[PDB]
């Protein structure tokens, strides 16, 4: 997706970290709205209790898991979800699995194929997700005012969708910035009641759920950055000691 | 101050290289430790029922079947109808009790009140899951792999060899029902 909104997220940058409360808000948004269509087959439910995530108490994760029910291997029959189970597959077969969507999408490109935009802005995954969620305008582009597809909705961020031939160009490729997506506009203001009394606008919920899906894609980002710092420090010390060794040794050869 | 010596500097570089090695080796052997397997110790919460073969279940825990058994309507009766001198396999041999006891009918139980007892379904002196369902004529289990019969208390009397149906860590048992923690 081109021209994704560069949303500032607290996990961005080498010192960035997840906001636990933003993660819990995103989890709530997903559970109440998004989980009806999409699934997260690669996310263990138990991971909601683990450090760096929403860090819910294990009794709360156990209560949460009980809302699901799954065809257990040993009984062959519908059995209430347990924390060791994964999140269920997408109930709508058309809807992609979200376990890795925040990594499986690039929001930033180029310039001119050079990859420098990604080099400073990152991959842009959760920013792309937010842009798609926020991407449904109030009014179509009016090029196919009487002519747009019926089972699909215009989104200004989505690029892979169908296009009406009146919007399409042979001379170019496509008039419109976006395309038509099969996903209906999923969010509405105050759709989710944040028990904290936090802002439940479309913007806020879209940020919160994009951050949750980012954690879903990289649940160990925190440990990865910590290890990065540790290795950088060790290699800095070793590099300086090896430099001084090399200089004092080769000073003999002079 | 530190020494001006060259060999001081050289050995300090060897020290930094040594720790930069040791911190790199440890992850390569640590990764072989248990990973997703540590959550095999699940809480095993279930909905209640009265009557022993009603609520009680061969349910899998520590990767293997378990029996959790309220001494409801056969097990305390037959427990009050089998002598300590009738049992063979003697010591309490129990992790939920602190220390040994002879051939004890309760103290195989979580409680001194002895309202719940628990045992591995995996009959372990060779390996089987004996058929529970309060079946076998001491009200317990019988082994199709081996031919033993068991006390409703999960304890051996008749069969080729004496080992009791062994007792895992269990407690809490609070919501009238199967629980672990």
């Amino acid at each position: 997706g081109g021209h994704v909104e560069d949303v500032p997220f607290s996990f961005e940058g080498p010192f960035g970290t997840f906001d636990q409360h933003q993660l819990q808000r995103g989890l709530q948004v997903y559970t109440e709205v998004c989980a009806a269509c999409h699934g997260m087959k690669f996310v263990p439910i138990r991971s909601l209790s683990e450090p760096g995530g929403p860090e819910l108490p294990e009794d709360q994760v156990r209560a949460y898991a009980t809302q699901f029910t799954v065809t257990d291997e040993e009984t062959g029959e519908d059995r209430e979800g347990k924390p060791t189970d994964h999140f269920p597959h997408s109930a709508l077969e058309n809807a992609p699995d979200l376990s890795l969507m925040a990594k499986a999408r690039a929001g930033f490109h180029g310039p001119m194929g050079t990859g420098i935009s990604q080099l400073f802005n990152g991959i842009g995954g959760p920013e792309y997700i937010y842009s798609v969620l926020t991407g449904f305008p109030e009014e179509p582009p009016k090029c196919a005012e009487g002519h747009e597809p019926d089972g699909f909705y215009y989104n200004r961020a989505f690029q892979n969708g169908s296009v009406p031939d009146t919007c399409k160009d042979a001379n170019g490729v496509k008039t419109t910035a976006g395309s038509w997506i099969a996903m209906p506009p999923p969010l509405m203001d105050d759709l989710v009641e944040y028990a904290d009394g936090h802002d439940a606008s479309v913007h806020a919920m879209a940020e919160d759920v994009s951050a949750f899906l980012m954690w879903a894609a990289e649940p160990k980002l925190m440990a990865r950055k910590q290890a990065g710092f540790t290795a950088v420090m060790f290699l800095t010390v070793l590099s300086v000691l090896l430099y001084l060794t090399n200089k004092r040794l080769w000073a003999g050869v002079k | 101050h530190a020494g001006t010596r060259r060999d001081f500097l050289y050995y300090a570089t060897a020290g930094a290289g040594a720790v930069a090695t040791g911190a790199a080796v440890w992850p390569l052997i640590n990764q072989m430790n248990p990973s997703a397997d540590v959550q095999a110790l699940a809480s095993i919460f279930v909905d209640v029922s009265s009557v022993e073969p009603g609520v009680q279940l061969t349910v899998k825990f520590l990767g293997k079947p378990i029996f959790i058994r309220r001494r409801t309507e056969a097990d305390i009766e037959l427990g009050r109808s089998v002598q300590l001198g009738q049992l063979v396999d003697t010591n309490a041999r129990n992790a939920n009790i602190d220390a040994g006891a002879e051939a004890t009918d309760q103290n195989r139980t979580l409680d001194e009140a002895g309202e719940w007892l628990v045992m591995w379904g995996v009959c372990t002196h060779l390996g089987c899951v004996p058929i529970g369902g309060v079946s076998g004529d001491f009200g317990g289990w019988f082994c199709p792999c081996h031919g033993s019969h068991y006390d409703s208390a999960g304890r051996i009397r008749k069969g080729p060899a004496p080992e009791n149906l062994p007792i895992p860590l269990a407690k809490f048992i609070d919501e009238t029902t199967i629980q672990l923690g």
Binding site: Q226, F229, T230, M233, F234, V237, L238, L241 | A2, G3, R5, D7, F8, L9, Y10, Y11, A12, T13, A14, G15, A16, A18, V19, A20
Partner: peptide, 27 residues
């Protein structure tokens, strides 16, 4: 006496790497 500098250097370089990788990364 011998191993004044050699041992002292080694332990110094080891500890320093452990120190500066820990505290500044964690804090």
């Amino acid at each position: 006496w011998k191993y004044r500098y050699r041992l002292g250097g080694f332990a110094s370089g080891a500890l320093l790497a452990l120190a500066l990788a820990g505290i500044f990364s964690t804090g």
